[PDB]
Amino acid sequence: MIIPVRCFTCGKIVGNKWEAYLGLLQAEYTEGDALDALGLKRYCCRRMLLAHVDLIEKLLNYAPLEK
Amino acid sequence: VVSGAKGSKINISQVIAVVGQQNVEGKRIPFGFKHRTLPHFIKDDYGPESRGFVENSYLAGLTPTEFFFHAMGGREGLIDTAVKTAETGYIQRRLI
Amino acid sequence: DDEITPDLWQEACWIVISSYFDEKGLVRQQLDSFDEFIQMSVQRIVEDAPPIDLQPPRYLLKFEQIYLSKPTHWDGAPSPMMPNEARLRNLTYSAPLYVDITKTVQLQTQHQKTFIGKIPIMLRSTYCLLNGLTDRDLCELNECPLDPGGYFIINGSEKVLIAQEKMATNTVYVFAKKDSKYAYTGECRSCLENSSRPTSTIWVSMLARQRIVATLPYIKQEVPIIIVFRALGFVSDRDILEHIIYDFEDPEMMEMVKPSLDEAFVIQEQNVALNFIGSRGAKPGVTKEKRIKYAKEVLQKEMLPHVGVSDFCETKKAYFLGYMVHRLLLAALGRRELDDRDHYGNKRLDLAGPLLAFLFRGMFKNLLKEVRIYAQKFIDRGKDFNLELAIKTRIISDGLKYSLATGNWGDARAGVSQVLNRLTFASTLSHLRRLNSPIGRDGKLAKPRQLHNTLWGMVCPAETPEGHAVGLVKNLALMAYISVGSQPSPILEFLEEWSMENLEEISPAAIADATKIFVNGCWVGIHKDPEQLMNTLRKLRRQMDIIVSEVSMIRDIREREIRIYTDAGRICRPLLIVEKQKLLLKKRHIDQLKEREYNNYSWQDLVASGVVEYIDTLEEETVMLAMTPD
DNA sequence: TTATTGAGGCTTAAGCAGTGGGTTCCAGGTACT
RNA sequence: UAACUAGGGAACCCACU
DNA sequence: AGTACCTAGCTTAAGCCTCAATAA
Ligand SMILES: [Zn+2]
């Protein structure tokens, strides 16, 4: 639902790179250039960001049961 | 293959060279439509690609007509497997 | 210059597919079928029910207008019920059904908008509370915007109606029975649509040896066909053979109708034939006139109800019976190939609409029956009875709820309604697009389980169970659409306006050269110029005229017939239209579809431009189809 | 000549591989107070 | 001054080998 | 009101029907 903290394969930190990836994508970068700008060199770290779906933003559209 | 662990020469030939002729009940792909196997062919077409000869390999990729005819063959295999188990169980019980 | 070049074709075709799925989605068959059920079929069933009458002071009751509220929950004040609340509280997502009853005894009173029962509402249909809501509004109701709907909530359980596959009605099929007493057998599951009595199947068979025999509904023993023809009011041999054989220069059919006439030499009068066919009924007649009246009732109602059920229609019924015998003869001559049972043009898919309509017919008949019971109990004392006390909403509400919950259909067959699979989203979509063949799963017949040729583009060739239900449980292809059903009337007025001569206004000598025209399987007349007629019918269908886009128009060319199909259950798919080796789809259509959310150009505008059209399986026989524009 | 006792053609049960999980259902109807 | 068990049937559906 | 209670297809063995030698 949310970006994993680490790449599953190697363990590089990718949890701090999802918002920066989205900011680079709206800055008209290609996905490959955005991955290269974040330092994700191994393709194991690259498909953590390339293939991620952020379900948490859809989960946040529902009001919490307590408030 | 040559260790005998898995596969056959037919599997290698199907992967590399050609898949071959798709069969339903021992014959070629029948005229399920009116004298056509599919609406993409002319009527009374008895050629290879019209009646279920897959000329491509698995690596090359099946054309959509070849894909459908291969699906027909695989469906026949699944039907045979299911009715085979269902019929052989009773023969086993009667024999024992 | 406006053509899509081959390097633009992949982008163009996927924009077309994206427009289709943006307009339609994936569960149009369920939602459209249920919407048609609620909008038309409920009112048709209520009005089609006979005006009930009790008798002495004699009064009658009539139901005239159907009102449906939004889904509502009640002891206290009624409040709107969201589907999530019905899911949580184990309630049934249902809407109240209101009718207004007139009571004429004479004194006429209006019981306006009386409550007769609760109808479960399929989610995201036009009568559901989530209809037309935005994604934000769906999320405010704790509903998933990606949820497709198409299911019912029955006691908090999500229920999906699996589409039931059946033989198509009102169509003549000739098969061969292996090693039976009949060599070739004809068959017509005749059913008058929008009334939908228990369907009547007639067999016109020929004995193996070569006499032609007719198997009639509600007659135990087999009946010679010439006796049936003389019982229709044709006491001759020129009349019967003119109804059967349209071409006197073919003597082989004359040879094959020798033995039926020879065996029917005993009877040459109409009432003798009525007595002969009524002596073998389900209820045997006490006397001769009872037998004659019973056989007349059978010929008027049970025998071929789709070609006509009232009186004074014996000539159309005799024409269709002669057509059945002619098809049987052509099959025995070999001039016509034997019909394929696994051909999906010969099959219909009973969706949520027709299944709920069958249930509603049974339950409305029941509700009327205890209205008779209550009124008969209270009329013996001479006192007036309240309609609110007479109406039993319990039986219709609980019967419909019970059949949607357990899946047992009728007051017969099971597994029609199933709990919706919610393991993953793909399983939900697959369960919502499931087709079921009701062939018994213990049989070893591989032919209904085999992947037939006619499933191209209609049914997925890969998605099937690998267990005992292999080849029987099927899954709908992505752009495959099931026809929702429509009235054949405007096509009939257009046909009689377009120089088509009716059956009762022609001599039988003109049948041989002209083209027979069938509308929903009913022979309505002949046309002497079938090519320009089919061009005109196609031009009307492409232009979104009085012929709607889901109407199937098939011209058999080798044997002169034009079949127009309008009923529900026909599985169809959109195809691009090719004229003079060129796609009618141009670059301007793709350019307009690119800004789909800007200029409001949609898939419907692409259909209305005559660019794409829906071709079902029977029409796909006559289609010369290109896989790619290459 | 003629019944009489023998042998060829029609309906109808009795069958039809195994292991888990889930869902629904196993009752209203007037009296009477 | 530890008082110690489990529960029915009939149908359907799905999955698995 | 609460409720007593009285009520689709297969194959095959087995049982059941009409026509021909044969003595009375
Ligand atoms: Zn990594």
From TrEMBL, chain A:
GO BP of this protein: transcription by RNA polymerase I; transcription by RNA polymerase II; tRNA transcription by RNA polymerase III
Keyword Zinc in record: yes
InterPro entries (UniProt xref): RNA_pol_su_RPB10, RNA_pol_suN_Zn-BS, RPABC5/Rpb10
Keywords noted in UniProt: DNA-directed RNA polymerase, Metal-binding, Transcription, Zinc
Keyword Transmembrane helix carried by entry: no
GO CC, any one term: RNA polymerase II, core complex
GO MF annotations, alphabetized: DNA binding; DNA-directed RNA polymerase activity; zinc ion binding
Superkingdom to which the source organism belongs: Eukaryota
Compartments where located: Nucleus
Main location, first listed in the record: nucleus
SUPFAM superfamilies: RNA polymerase subunit RPB10
Residues annotated to bind Zn(2+): 7, 10, 44-45
Family: Belongs to the archaeal Rpo10/eukaryotic RPB10 RNA polymerase subunit family.
Functional summary from the UniProt entry: DNA-dependent RNA polymerase catalyzes the transcription of DNA into RNA using the four ribonucleoside triphosphates as substrates. Common component of RNA polymerases I, II and III which synthesize ribosomal RNA precursors, mRNA precursors and many functional non-coding RNAs, and a small RNAs, such as 5S rRNA and tRNAs, respectively.
HAMAP family: RNApol_arch_Rpo10
Name of the protein described by the UniProt record: DNA-directed RNA polymerases I, II, and III subunit RPABC5
Species of the source: Pedionomus torquatus (Plains-wanderer)
Gene encoding the protein: Polr2l
UniProtKB/TrEMBL annotation, chain B:
Highest taxon in the source lineage: Eukaryota
UniProt-annotated location(s): Chromosome; Cytoplasm; Nucleus
Reported function: DNA-dependent RNA polymerase catalyzes the transcription of DNA into RNA using the four ribonucleoside triphosphates as substrates.
Family the UniProt entry places it in: Belongs to the RNA polymerase beta' chain family.
Protein name: DNA-directed RNA polymerase subunit
Record organism: Sus scrofa
From TrEMBL, chain C:
Cofactor(s) required, per the database record: Mg(2+)
One cellular component (GO) term of this entry: nucleoplasm
Origin superkingdom: Eukaryota
EC number: 2.7.7.6
Keyword set includes Phosphoprotein: yes
Family named by the database record: Belongs to the RNA polymerase beta chain family.
Function in brief: RNA-dependent RNA polymerase that catalyzes the extension of a non-coding RNA (ncRNA) at the 3'-end using the four ribonucleoside triphosphates as substrates. An internal ncRNA sequence near the 3'-end serves as a template in a single-round Pol II-mediated RNA polymerization reaction. May decrease the stability of ncRNAs that repress Pol II-mediated gene transcription. DNA-dependent RNA polymerase catalyzes the transcription of DNA into RNA using the four ribonucleoside triphosphates as substrates.
Name of the protein in its database record: DNA-directed RNA polymerase subunit beta
Annotated source species: Sus scrofa domesticus
